[PDB]
Design a binder for this molecule. Sequence first.
Ligand SMILES: CC(=O)N[C@H]1CN[C@H](CO)[C@H](O)[C@@H]1O
Ligand SMILES: [Ca+2]
Ligand SMILES: [Zn+2]
Length: 630
Amino acid sequence: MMQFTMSGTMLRFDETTLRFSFSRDGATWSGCDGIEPQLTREDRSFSFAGAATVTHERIETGTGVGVRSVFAGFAGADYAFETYIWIERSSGDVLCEWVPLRECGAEPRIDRVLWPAPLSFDRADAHDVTLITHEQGVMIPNSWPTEVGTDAVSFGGRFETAGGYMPWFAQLRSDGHAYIAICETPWNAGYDIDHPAGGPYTHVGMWFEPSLGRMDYRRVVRYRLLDHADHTAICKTYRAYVNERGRLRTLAEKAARNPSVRDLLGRSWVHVGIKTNVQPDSSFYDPAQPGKNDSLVTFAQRERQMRTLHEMGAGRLYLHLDGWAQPGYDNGHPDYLPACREAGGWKGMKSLIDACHEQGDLFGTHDQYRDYYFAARTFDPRNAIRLADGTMPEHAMWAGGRQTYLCAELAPDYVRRNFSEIATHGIVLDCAYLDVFTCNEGDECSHPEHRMTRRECYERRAECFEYLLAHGILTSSEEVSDWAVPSLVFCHYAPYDFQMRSPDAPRHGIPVPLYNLVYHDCVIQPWMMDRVAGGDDYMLYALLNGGAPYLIRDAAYAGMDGDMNAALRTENDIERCAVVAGLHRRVGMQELVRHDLVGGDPLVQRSVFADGTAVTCDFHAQTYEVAANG
Ligand SMILES: CC(=O)N[C@H]1CN[C@H](CO)[C@H](O)[C@@H]1O
Ligand SMILES: [Ca+2]
Ligand SMILES: [Zn+2]
């Protein structure tokens, strides 16, 4: 056994078990008993202690003190690596480094790495909770009724996706003593969660996958232990962390570059489409109903629709237009041109835009630069992703049918080409929507002509956005995975997980806005307005989160993109929008300082902002209150 103390914190680490535990402000935490850190190969799991040779080195640096462990020989295969577990002098934080060394013609490839092993947290106490970044956020009591497994989180608990908006998780006791684990190297990483139904425990661990088939580079987790800590405070920890590395890009900062940003406050959302053209090979094809597959609303009709919506006194509107190009929604991409002839052509579309501006309303196209359809006019496999095994992925899920994925290295080329074309026919977009980018994982590509790491992928996607900000077109994408913050103005939404499920489907936990706690002054988000019959009004959640409202939110596919059943429930729309929007017109660019569960009652909550303005929402009474005091 090796023990360390420094700057308020103590790390102990057992040379034989490898289990570690660390302590600060007198609370302790330890690795779970009997769960060990593991490699995983195509052909079996190893513990790290399974190593043929293991050494340990006690180490003191100018920066900190801890231990460095080499691990060599496995099964019989060669293969080695290190770990380094240590206390930063400056801060009283603990840092965990998994470090590749030798990999060889491995055989098989190391498929995953579960380390550091999850911290013991097995109480049951209902005020003993776990926080996770699955979409807008989830608080998970060690009691909580329902099962929560990794396999029930989107994208398998992958960071930089809807599955984990931000690269961290945290576990908090009723004490007020908590820990936050931040993934400093997320691009090939995610979390794992095991909460059996009814608890008593909740285990959470970081996993790491290879980068183009090799672990390649150091992976690093940073733990900060807290005292007198609520879920709001925990969020701030990470906030600070990000700003301390200069990726807390505020709306303000963004405004100073493109001032139209401000124009987005108060506005109301209108998501609706032109052409629909589901293909025979599409997983959505209905070989009966040819009308369901194939439908068209002209630019003209959308023009009328928008006038009408002004006259009725809707107010300030952003229009997002799906399906505006010749191929039809989710057809032809990236060759999504020209604007649909049978809908009006460039003229009908230009005419419609002009008209939105003319009543002080804004407008974005719905566009796509990852999905790459075989049908596209200039389809060519040499532009497509190859996976680390050299294979080219395929599917035919969406409208346009058979597709692969465009290597992002080349996306910016195609953004530049398309949008330049759009703007030569007198179209002047206020915004644009680059689909998928911020929802899905970043691809990796082994094609030698455009080799690209997941890390690199997010950088290209961000380059796509930046072309738009540079031509005064604001940027939107599907959701809000935190990589995109520096370049992302607003989204299609930042929902909680339970909004993307049937209301009948049990929830995984209390809906707390972890993302907006961190980023509400950096990204504008519209919100669902649907009322659940026998349940919640989703407007209520809009308020807590200080967002703008969906007025009209047409699905593109029945069932998809949080399209609620019909076990639904609402008249009085514009009114409802106007209420939430005027809140948005106020505090839309401010921090969100606090969120609190009133009296520790889950179904009553308050969100306090920078200007003092508080939002109390009661989910028994289905009632809501917007003050000014705080
Ligand atoms: C909300 C939204 O635009 N979701 C889209 C997300 N992307 C898929 C295709 O990748 C579909 O177009 C889907 O409708
Ligand atoms: Ca859309
Ligand atoms: Zn490539």
